[PDB]
């Protein structure tokens, strides 16, 4: 009777049929694999909206400790969850040829290696009964062990500016959350795939909502357009300074100088910097002049980079806790653990301790 997804054959149409049937009451879906059966209570994520170039994208949550979640666009679907400590993504595109493109893309780093356990890290999933690829499974923890690439990091990934003077606006919980747009611009000459950008956006918004019950204060609305801007060199600081300047000469962006902006690319910057941000540059009461802007990679192997940079924009410092999203080297963790950072972030979104969690 209960709906299920067979991970040995999961396709775009499987994911779309199951997730489109999720009502406001939620729905139990069993994830099945060889000797694996996880019952997941799936709900629509109504906190976040996403428009990419070509599609509206909807998000879905489980309520489990292994944070099962889904992404559903018109063109693609993602299932992500943790299993035995490691994050696993199932990525399924609707058009067979773009699925073929995506599979080739993700298979390419493993071409050199002939690892005996390759399928643990990367596997093409074939249509149920030459078969076609209908999804790919990626375990980035096992992939990192196999590929053994040099680590990218965040050292010196922000620009700090003289601290704002204090100037009595604080209020209780608003009757509705404030809508904050996160306007993402695909860097000129960059190829971004929708599963990769959407995952970063989901992780970014969710890193904020997990703090001080902030969905009462903010609902993020992501929008992705193309920009003619590209960073003039590999310098990240220079790149951001030029990006912020490019927002001021975009006649389309007039009227939205009080929103949050990211320049996104697939790759990284010089010294293997993953992103860049203006530090403590967004406050709900004062946001202006495109100051809440930053840059972020979108590659699947670096989850949470845009969350990390959004943390900086909202005032979060690096921490010494290697389990924190805000650690200065890349950890793959996705949650704020610093109480000081949590208080700073929430205060910039209008929360005060009197309001509770």
């Amino acid at each position: 009777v209960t709906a299920s997804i067979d991970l040995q054959s999961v396709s775009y149409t499987d994911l779309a049929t199951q997730l489109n049937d999720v009502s406001d009451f939620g729905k139990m879906i069993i994830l099945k694999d060889n000797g694996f059966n996880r019952q997941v209570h799936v709900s629509m994520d109504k906190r976040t909206k996403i428009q990419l170039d070509n599609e509206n994208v909807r998000l879905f949550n489980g309520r489990d400790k292994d944070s099962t979640s889904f992404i559903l666009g018109d063109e693609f679907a993602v299932l992500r969850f943790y299993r035995n400590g490691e994050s696993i993504s199932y990525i399924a595109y609707k058009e067979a040829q773009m699925m073929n493109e995506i599979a080739e893309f993700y298979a390419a780093p493993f071409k050199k290696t002939r690892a005996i356990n390759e399928k643990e890290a990367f596997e093409c999933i074939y249509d149920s009964r030459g078969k076609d690829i209908v999804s790919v499974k990626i375990n980035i923890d096992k992939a990192k062990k196999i590929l053994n690439l040099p680590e990218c990091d965040y050292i010196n990934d922000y620009i700090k500016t003289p601290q704002v003077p204090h100037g009595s606006q604080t209020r209780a919980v608003p009757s509705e959350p404030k809508t904050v747009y996160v306007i993402c611009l695909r860097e000129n000459g960059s190829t971004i795939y929708p599963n990769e950008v959407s995952a970063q956006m989901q992780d970014a918004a969710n890193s904020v909502y997990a703090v001080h019950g902030l969905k009462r204060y903010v609902n993020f609305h992501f929008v992705l357009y193309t920009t003619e801007y590209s960073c003039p060199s590999g310098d990240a600081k220079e790149g951001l300074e030029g990006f912020t300047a490019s927002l001021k000469s975009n006649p389309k962006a007039e009227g939205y100088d009080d929103q949050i902006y990211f320049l996104i690319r697939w790759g990284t910057w010089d010294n293997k910097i993953l992103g860049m941000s203006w530090f403590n540059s967004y406050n709900v009461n004062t946001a202006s002049d495109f100051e809440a802007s930053g840059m972020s990679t979108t590659q699947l192997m670096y989850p949470g980079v845009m969350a990390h940079e959004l943390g900086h924009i909202l005032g979060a410092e690096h921490t010494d806790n290697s389990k924190d999203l805000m650690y200065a080297t890349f950890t793959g963790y996705l949650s704020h653990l610093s109480e000081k950072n949590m208080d700073i972030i929430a205060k910039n979104l209008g929360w005060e301790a009197a309001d509770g969690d």
Epitope: D74, K94, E95, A96, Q97, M98, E101, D127, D132
Partner: nanobody
Framework: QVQLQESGGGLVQPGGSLRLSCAAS????????MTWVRQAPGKGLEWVSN????????YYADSVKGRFTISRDNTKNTLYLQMNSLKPEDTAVYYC???????????????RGQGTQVTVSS
């Protein structure tokens, strides 16, 4: 193997209409972006139109926009090209094809049908 077979070609006078059909088998048609291309004698292969898996998105060469309509029936595994307001420069062999990628205009294809002849006299 992939099999594609075009039909519906013929000779018309300028201003005429034709409807091309392409019967597909050997692959899961309903999952694939599909393409019409045409080739005039001694000329390069010219992209005509794309349609995505479910028919919700269509794309056209500038020279045929407003005159040609691509469509598909995923239950009958058939691709269509409705050709109105035909002109002499539409004369060519027309092929339905699986493009290697979804980007437009495609120039690289995985398989093609054997073609159907369209002639518009002048």
């Amino acid at each position: 193997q992939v099999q594609l077979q075009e039909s519906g070609g013929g000779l018309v006078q300028p201003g005429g209409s034709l409807r091309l059909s392409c019967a597909a088998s050997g692959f899961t048609f309903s999952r694939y972006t599909m393409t019409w291309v045409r080739q005039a004698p001694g000329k390069g292969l010219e992209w005509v139109s794309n349609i995505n898996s479910d028919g919700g998105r269509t794309y056209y060469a500038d020279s045929v926009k407003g005159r040609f309509t691509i469509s598909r029936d995923n239950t009958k595994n058939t691709l269509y090209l409705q050709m109105n307001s035909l002109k002499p420069e539409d004369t060519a062999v027309y092929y339905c094809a699986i493009p290697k990628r979804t980007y437009v205009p495609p120039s690289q294809f995985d398989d093609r049908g054997q073609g159907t002849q369209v002639t518009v006299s002048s």
